[PDB]
Amino acid sequence: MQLTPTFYDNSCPNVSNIVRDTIVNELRSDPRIAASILRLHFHDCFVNGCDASILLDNTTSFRTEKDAFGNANSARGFPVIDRMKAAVESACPRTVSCADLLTIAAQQSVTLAGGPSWRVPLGRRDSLQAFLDLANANLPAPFFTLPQLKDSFRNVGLNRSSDLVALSGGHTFGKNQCRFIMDRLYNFSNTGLPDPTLNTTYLQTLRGLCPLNGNLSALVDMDLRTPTIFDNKYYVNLEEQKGLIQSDQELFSSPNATDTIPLVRSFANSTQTFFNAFVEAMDRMGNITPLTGTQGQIRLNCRVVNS
Contacted by 245, from ligand HEM, ligand BHO, Ca ion, none: CB < 5 to 8 Å by type: ligand HEM
Comparison of 47 and 206: residue with beta carbon closer to Ca ion: 47
Q: What secondary structure, in 3-state letters, does the chain show? A: CCCECCCCCCCCCCHHHHHHHHHHHHHHHCCCHHHHHHHHHHHHHCCCCCCCHHHCCCCCCCCCHHHCCCCCCCCCCHHHHHHHHHHHHHHCCCCCCHHHHHHHHHHHHHHHCCCCCCCCCECCEECCCCCHHHHHHHCCCCCCCHHHHHHHHHCCCCCCHHHHHHHHHHHHCCEEEHHHCHHHHHCHHHCCCCCCCCCHHHHHHHHHHCCCCCCCCCEEECCCCCCCCCCCHHHHHHHCCCCCCHHHHHHHHCCCCCCCHHHHHHHHCCHHHHHHHHHHHHHHHCCCCCECCCCCECCCECCECCC
Distance CA 70, CA 141 (A): 8
Total chain residues near ligand HEM (CB under 6 A): 24
Q: Which of residues 69-88 bind ligand BHO (CB under 6 A)?
A: 69-70
**229 lines the binding site for Ca ion (CB under 5 A):** yes
Q: For residues 7 and 180, which CB has a smaller minimum distance to ligand BHO in the complex?
A: 180
- Examine residue 250 and tell whether it contacts Ca ion (CB under 5 A): no
Flag whether 41 is marked binding: no
Closest to ligand HEM by CB, 77 vs 194, is 77
The nearer residue to ligand BHO, 15 or 34, going by C-beta atoms, is: 34
**Cβ neighbours of 208 (radius 10 Å):** 9
By the rule CB under 6 A, 32 interacts with ligand HEM: yes
Which residue in 41, 43, 85, 184 is the catalytic one?
43
226 known ligand binder: yes
Measured CA angle at 120 (ends 260, 113), to 5 deg: 70
Q: Is 42 in the site for ligand HEM (CB under 6 A)?
A: yes
Whether 109 contacts 35, CB under 8 Å: yes
41 a catalytic residue: no
Q: Which stretch binds ligand HEM (CB under 6 A): 16-24, 92-100, 164-172, 298-306?
A: 164-172
Tell whether residue 142 is a contact of ligand BHO (CB under 6 A): yes
| 47 labelled binding-site residue | yes
Report whether 282 contacts 167 (CB < 8 A).
yes
Q: Rule CB under 5 A: say whether 126 interacts with Ca ion.
A: no
Cα–Cα separations (whole angstroms), residue 115 to 28, 66, 93, 111, 284? 18, 27, 31, 4, 18
Question: Under the criterion CB under 6 A, does residue 243 sit at the interface with ligand BHO?
Answer: no
Judged by beta carbon distances under 5 to 8 A according to partner kind, the member of a copy of itself, ligand HEM, Ca ion, none in contact with residue 36 is ligand HEM
Residue 172 among known ligand-binding residues? yes
* The entry of ligand HEM, Ca ion, a copy of itself, none that residue 303 binds, CB within 5 to 8 Å by partner kind: a copy of itself
Per CB under 6 A, which region of 17-25, 140-148, 265-273, 297-305 contacts ligand BHO? Answer: 140-148
205 belongs to an annotated ligand binding site: no
Closer residue to a copy of itself in complex, CB, 175/303: 303
Residue 140 marked in a binding site: yes
Region near ligand HEM per CB under 6 A, out of 18-26, 122-130, 138-146, 263-271: 138-146
**Active site members:** 43
Q: Which residues are annotated as a binding site for heme b?
A: 171
The residues that touch Ca ion, with contacts defined as CB under 5 A, are 44, 47-48, 51, 53, 172, 223, 226, 229, 231, 233
